[PDB]
Design a protein around this ligand. Sequence first.
Ligand SMILES: Oc1ccc(O)cc1
Ligand SMILES: Oc1ccc(O)cc1
Ligand SMILES: [Zn+2]
Ligand SMILES: [Zn+2]
Ligand SMILES: [Zn+2]
Ligand SMILES: [Zn+2]
Lengths: 287, 287
Amino acid sequence: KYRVRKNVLHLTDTEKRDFVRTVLILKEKGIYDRYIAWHGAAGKFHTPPGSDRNAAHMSSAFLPWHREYLLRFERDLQSINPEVTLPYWEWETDAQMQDPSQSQIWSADFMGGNGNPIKDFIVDTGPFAAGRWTTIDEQGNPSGGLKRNFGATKEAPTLPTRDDVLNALKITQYDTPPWDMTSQNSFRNQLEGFINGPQLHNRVHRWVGGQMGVVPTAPNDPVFFLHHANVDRIWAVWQIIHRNQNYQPMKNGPFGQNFRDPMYPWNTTPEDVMNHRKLGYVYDIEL
Amino acid sequence: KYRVRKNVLHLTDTEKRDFVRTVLILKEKGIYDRYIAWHGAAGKFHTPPGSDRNAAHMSSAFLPWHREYLLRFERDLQSINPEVTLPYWEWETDAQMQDPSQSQIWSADFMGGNGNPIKDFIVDTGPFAAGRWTTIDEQGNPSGGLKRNFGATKEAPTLPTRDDVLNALKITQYDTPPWDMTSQNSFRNQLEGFINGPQLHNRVHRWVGGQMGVVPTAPNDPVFFLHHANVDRIWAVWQIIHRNQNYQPMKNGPFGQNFRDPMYPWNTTPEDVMNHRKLGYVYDIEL
Ligand SMILES: Oc1ccc(O)cc1
Ligand SMILES: Oc1ccc(O)cc1
Ligand SMILES: [Zn+2]
Ligand SMILES: [Zn+2]
Ligand SMILES: [Zn+2]
Ligand SMILES: [Zn+2]
C-alpha cells in the first residue's frame, strides 16, 4: 500500500531520468538479462508438454506470472534507488491520439522513438538506442540493438482503446476451461488478447514491433515492463470490481496453472501474488 | 548431516523401488519437467553474453549450480517420501568392469538398460522405457522416448577411471582465470572435463549417449541426477582434502560466477551451497 506506481505521463522529468538510469544500471550489472531469460524460458515451458499453454502465456498463469515478474523487477530497481517504482504505460488513452507515436513516452528522455527504417528499424533515439543498449537473441547471444516499428502490421495497426479495456472488465469469470488460447468468456484470455486477436495485451506487443513483437525477445525493450504494469493495473481493477470472484483454476487444471501450483521458473504460486497490495505496492488511481 | 546419499550399488531392492517410484511421481505431477527446463535455460544463459560461459557449465559456477540443482531435486523427492534420498552413480568403479553395461545400476528394476539398436537406440527396458516415460526436446515439446547408446562415441568410448578421479583431487586451486573452458590447473575445469576433454563429468555424459549426450536434453534421463550426485560427492571430497582452499572467483569474474553472485535461474549464490553438510545431507563414505 506504500509503493505507488504512476502513470508514465504523470512522471516528473527527474522521475523519468531516475527510472531510465536505474534500468541502465540493472543492465550493466547483468541483472536485467536475467529477466529476459526468465521470460524466454517460461515461454518454452509447456503445461503440460504437448499443449500450447506455457508457464507465462496462453493460460491462466499469464496474469499472476507477470505480476510476480514485475514485483521481482521492481525490487531490483529499488535495490539501486529505493525511490524508483515501476510506472505503467496507459496505452488505452494513447490510442485516443490520431498519432500515438507522438506520445511523450517515446520521447528521447524516456523510452526513445520508433525504429529507423534506414537502419532496419533500429532505435536510434533515446537512452536505449543502438550503441547504448545491447540486446540478446533467442539463443542468448548479442543481437545488435533495440528495434521497433510502430503499427506496421496489418493485424495490429492501432493500440487497444479505452472501450476495449472497459469490455474486458465486464467479464465475470477470471478464466474458463480449457484454460488456454481458446477460453471464452474469460477475463484472462480477453485481456491477454486472444479473443478475436490480437487485442489488448497481445495487440500492444505487435503494435510496438521489433523485439516486443515476439515472445523470446520481448523484454529486450524496457517498455515491456511499462506495458505489463498497465496490464497488471487493469487486472487489479478487475479484482476490485469483482469482489465475489477469485483466481481460476483452483484445482484440476494443468500443473503450474492452479491456484497453489508453483509458476516456472520460480516457486511462486498465483495465490502468493493474488493480492497486489499485500505485495507492497499500489497504482496511483487507487488513491 | 541427516540425509545420507548412498552408492547406487549399496541400495536395497526396496530402496531402488522407492526411488524409482518417487521419480515417477515427480514426473507425473509435472515437477520433474521443471528440472529439465531449468537446466536447459541455464545452458542458454551466457555470462557474459557473447562468451561460451553459461550459468551452469563451462565456468566456475558449474559445481555450485548443480549442487543447488540436486538439493532442490532431493527436497522434491522428500516431499513425496521423506525417507528417499538421491543416490550417486560411482562410475569410476563401474569403469573397472570389462563391460560396464552389466552394472546393476542398469538393471530392469532401476535405471534400465542400454538403447535397443533395432529401435534406433530407444530404451525398451526398465521403468523409464518408451511407453512408460515421456521425454521433451530442446523446445519443450514431447520427443518420444529415452535413448541411450553406451560408449558409441569416438571421443568417449569408456567411463572415466578411478585414477582419473584421484588426479583431479590433487589439484590445489578450485578454479583459475579466465574461469572457462581453458582454465588450467583448475579442479572445477578438470572435474567438469575440458582438460584434454572429454574427461570425467563430460565423458560420462558422452558415454551414456542419447539425451544424456546433449546439454538441453540431458536431464530427460534420471541417471543425470545419479551422475551429478557422484560429481557432487567428488567435489565434497576435494573440499575436505583442501579445507583451506575456497571457491574462485571471489570477485571480478563474470557476473553470475562470483562467490556471492546469484546463479541463474535462481537467486542462490555459490556461498549458499559451499558447505554441503549445512544443506542437510551427507554422502555414505563420510560415515
Ligand atoms: O513474450 C511475449 C509474450 C506475449 C506476447 O503477446 C508477446 C511477447
Ligand atoms: O548441462 C549439461 C552439461 C553436459 C551435458 O552433456 C548435458 C547438460
Ligand atoms: Zn511475454
Ligand atoms: Zn507480454
Ligand atoms: Zn560396493
Ligand atoms: Zn552434467
